[PDB]
Amino acid sequence: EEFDAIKIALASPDMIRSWSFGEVKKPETINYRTFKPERDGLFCARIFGPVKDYECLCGKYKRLKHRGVICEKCGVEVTQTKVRRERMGHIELASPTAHIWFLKSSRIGLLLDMPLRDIERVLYFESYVVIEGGMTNLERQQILTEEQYLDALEEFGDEFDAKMGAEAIQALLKSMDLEQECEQLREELNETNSETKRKKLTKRIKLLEAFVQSGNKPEWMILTVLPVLPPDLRPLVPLDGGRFATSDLNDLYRRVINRNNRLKRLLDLAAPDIIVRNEKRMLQEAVDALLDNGRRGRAITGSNKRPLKSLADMIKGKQGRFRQNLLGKRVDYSGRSVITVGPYLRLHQCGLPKKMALELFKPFIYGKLELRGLATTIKAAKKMVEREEAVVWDILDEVIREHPVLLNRAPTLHRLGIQAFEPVLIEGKAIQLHPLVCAAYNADFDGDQMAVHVPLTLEAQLEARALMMSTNNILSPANGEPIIVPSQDVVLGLYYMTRDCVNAKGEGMVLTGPKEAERLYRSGLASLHARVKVRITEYEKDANGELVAKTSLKDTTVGRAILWMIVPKGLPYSIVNQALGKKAISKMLNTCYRILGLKPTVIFADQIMYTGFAYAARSGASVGIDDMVIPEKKHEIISEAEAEVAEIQEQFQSGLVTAGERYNKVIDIWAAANDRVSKAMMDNLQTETVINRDGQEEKQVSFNSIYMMADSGARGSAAQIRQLAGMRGLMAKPDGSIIETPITANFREGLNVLQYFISTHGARKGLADTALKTANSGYLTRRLVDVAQDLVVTEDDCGTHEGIMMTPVIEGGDVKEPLRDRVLGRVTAEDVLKPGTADILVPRNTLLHEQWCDLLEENSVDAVKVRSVVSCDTDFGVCAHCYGRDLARGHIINKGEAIGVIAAQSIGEPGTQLTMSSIQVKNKGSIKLSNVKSVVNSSGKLVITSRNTELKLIDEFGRTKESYKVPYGAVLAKGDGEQVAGGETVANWDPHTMPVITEVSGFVRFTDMIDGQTITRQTDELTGLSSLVVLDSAERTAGGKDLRPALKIVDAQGNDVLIPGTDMPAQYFLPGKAIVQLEDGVQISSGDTLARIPQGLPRVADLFEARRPKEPAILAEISGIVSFGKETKGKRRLVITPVDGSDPYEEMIPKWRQLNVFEGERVERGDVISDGPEAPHDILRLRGVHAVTRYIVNEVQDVYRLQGVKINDKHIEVIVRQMLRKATIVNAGSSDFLEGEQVEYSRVKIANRELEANGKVGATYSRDLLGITKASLATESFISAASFQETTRVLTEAAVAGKRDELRGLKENVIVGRLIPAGTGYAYHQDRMRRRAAG
């Protein structure tokens, strides 16, 4: 009963007769008059057990006089009737018929070297096959028609062997030898390991060996026994009005017994074989639909025309047991009702109704009617709670005091979607919730309802107290943010409370305390927002962890003073010297966590809610139609707009320009007309009050209500204040192209009849996307859990070497990613050091808390190697010192948690939101360049002759500040070693410059490059000074396509002038599209040119899927110059010819794509050869593993950072690590030659072959790179692969391979219902990790 692992293998023909309880010999079910089972059908009491407990068909043995004997007088046992869940039936088959999961998947053609289509004709009684050819006139395994069947029969008589049917395929499986036919493939594997002839051994060396080791036989792919599901698992039960009801397995068993009966009746009656054949193919239909119905043939149905539910349909899909029944279940001791606002509450409190908890807490209530003595029996107690009697409340009232409870909202989209609560019982019918848990739940009070759950056992109350309580969670597990940020009502009322109006009463008078400030406003003798001179008594913990206080005189307003009677003794006044909008608030409550701790902030959250509600209602900010004002000059823009589109429309009638340019000028004008409208209202909204107070007129922030929400960040925005004031941009018809005319009225002026039709385009288009791609992001989150399943942090620290290197992601333009919010909480990989060298704080590892981000702020070091969990080396779990801070708590992370099922919720929960040249220096900095080869030109400017140099503007400090890229030989103005001010246009280049600049000055003549062969002469008629123009390869002569153009810039004697400082020739083998400037005899200086070459969510998905993009740019393999091969044969060639290494590489690349390095030109390992995207499968292979991580943590980041939705970058790192848990083995010693194996497994293998047992007989490996619907099915645990997708692929590919489980993953114990080995249940499980080794 205590069991450890779960084994799957094939079942023997004999094992099922050791399973079952006899035979079924009939098709009957039950007796139609007396609704009792029949004998030897699919219901018989003799086979499977009784119908009533301890009662048989006659009725001899009843009421447990005789316990466990059998009633002879019918054959029926006397035991329990729960045994009807267990007892299986078995039928002999007349002929052995094939199993479908080892046919259609392929496991039986691949096992026999035959096609799956070329098997069926032997099964379907169409064509004989050679069983054992002693005479070699017909080679074995041959598809012989009935015509030639007579021809060879007369030649050989009985000296040959040839049968047809699915018992002949048993004879084919019977003949051959496992180990002998494995000997030959193991021998001739090393002949010629071709890529089109590798896997047909590499699969077959796996499968032929697996039959020997796992103890399996080649005969067991056929069925001679059909096991029967026990009848309680296929129950035909009575409904009410004489009608009955059956599962789909009753009737599908009936079509097999009768065909196993009619075939029985044919053999004795000496039947013709053409009858016996057509009987056999009906059984072949009947077996297949019983196992997997809609797989092979026309779907056998009932009378209601739907396909019958097969057994595989009871496994596959959303209606299979692995998803609908064993991961998500119904649960008792639970209820639900509509939620509503409870404003008065405290944080740990939920508002539960009285009329509800009588049925959740019913056996808890029964617990203290018997123990109190107020009920002698339970039936005495049952009809008291149903009478709603007097003590019933006050016994329940004792119980629910200090009894936790759960509240859950579907979809519980992250870890805070189910939080514990403690009830405080109200009398009513709905559920009142705390106002600062709405933002944690995505709750709008518009009709949603939540589920409540009862923590029954003792730990369940302890876990609800300690782990998930609503006061235990304040912060995010995604980032440092608090999820207790006040949303809309209070954030107006705080902004109304703290304000500065210059006029009210009592301007600049004296006050003595914030108590007497509230003596003033509550008396009407002052106002809230009016400046005064006060005194406060603040505190500080700038002593040795001790409260130090001081006291000064201040300057503030009255309403700002009253708020200071709340804050708990740890902050300066410098948070509340303002108007207190939203971002003015989110730094207050974040700081009091970073100063005081949780239990202060539990009160501090409940206490601002007690005043921002009571004040905004007291002030009251209604919204009249005159609070919505209209811009005054709004019409006069539209008349100017119909003046500016006036000359555009009448001009196209003349034809001076096309509609193709006219459109964007109309897109220009109506935007730039609106960009005068959308500015106009923002004069007389934010300062439209010009008040007067002992002065002429004084201007300030206005008191209009729709502005105050926008000035607080409560509702609306800049683009949303438009459509209540002015014209609402442009609105697109849903094809993609946009109309020329905006909607020139806002809503306050009323839309036109026709424009509202155009307005309805965006109404569905927004709603037929935001309600469609919610499903397209849900399926994303599921595979994020799956590849991050079995990871559980199971150490403190192994302490390996250094890891990945951080550098800020300021790239392109402005300072996009400061390093302070990338190194925060991280573990320092190594000892780090200042710009002052050898000035080290850290002994290779520490916790970077809130001061060290400010330490590296001061010192201009801005490049940090950090420890990331891919750079750990421990298997089946990671060390905590590569992860970082426990974001949900704020300390270093403990031993036992799962971070992968954290990180999968950090991605999908934002996923339901995010579906929809010349170069200048910007500021005073230096100029730095890296990987540089450049040359001074004739002018005295620069041209860059390196694919890999970037323009960097270092300030006076020593950290990077900007970055721009440069192409090959753009027209620069500056060099290096300079510190030039911003505002100049230095890297100035055309969109068409791809120069054929040389580095070395010389003399240009015509040489080796004739007209007619490789050139069409295009002498420029207007100026004369063109040359023989190199065009592309696809327009020249094929007699001249054997070579390329190659211009030899000469010295006096005629040689190609070399690169200065090397003995190698550098003349230009010209690439395509090159118009050469000057003709024979001319010169070019250094740096001067020979010729000129003129020219969301599924993006999130493809990176974690590693979808190889459609136009892959190619990337190199090793250093060295290039040779070329075949010219214009479908696709061209490129031959790798290194500096010293051997040169065998040649690749079918196109010339149809443009190049980067020239033909006689060198390139390096890991660089690019073309232009375009790339598959990361290369970028793991050619460039090391510490770039594909820096790719994916940054390439996917331009989606989530785009909408500014912050996720800490440890969460990309954990789940790309799971995409690399494999290898491609190259050498040998333990494995096959070129098979696949987990690198975490083969590092246990090289843990000993290089350890002192062996010197080195090990094997060498690359790294594999999978997606996320591949890396989960390429995992050792077969239950998880059956738990997720494609089980018909899985359970056959797991069966013959003998694949066990180990109960390690967080699904692997749920399906058995065991405790999770994480956190609370981890230390229990490591005892089981040793109690097998200790016993």
Binding site: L458, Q461, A466, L598, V602, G896, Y1322
Partner: protein, 79 residues
């Protein structure tokens, strides 16, 4: 305590053992028939145990001494 578990995981150092030291501790008053050491305050035992920890008198080790000495007062008591 009643509202948070911070001031007891400052002592224990883990979000799961504070459940596990009290999963062990809070059975002795349900069916063990014993009494706590702190003032009771009409409390259900999943926080009465949490009180005994966060009053500094209980870690995992000190529970293991009162469960050892109970067995050596039944072992020679039989003989």
């Amino acid at each position: 305590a009643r509202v948070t578990v911070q001031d007891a995981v400052e002592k224990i150092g883990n979000r799961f053992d504070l459940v596990l030291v009290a999963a062990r501790r809070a059975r002795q008053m349900q069916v063990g028939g014993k009494d706590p050491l702190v003032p009771e305050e009409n409390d259900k035992t999943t926080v009465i145990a949490l009180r005994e920890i966060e009053e500094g008198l209980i870690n995992n080790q000190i529970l293991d001494v009162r469960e050892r000495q109970e067995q050596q007062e039944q072992e020679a008591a039989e003989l």
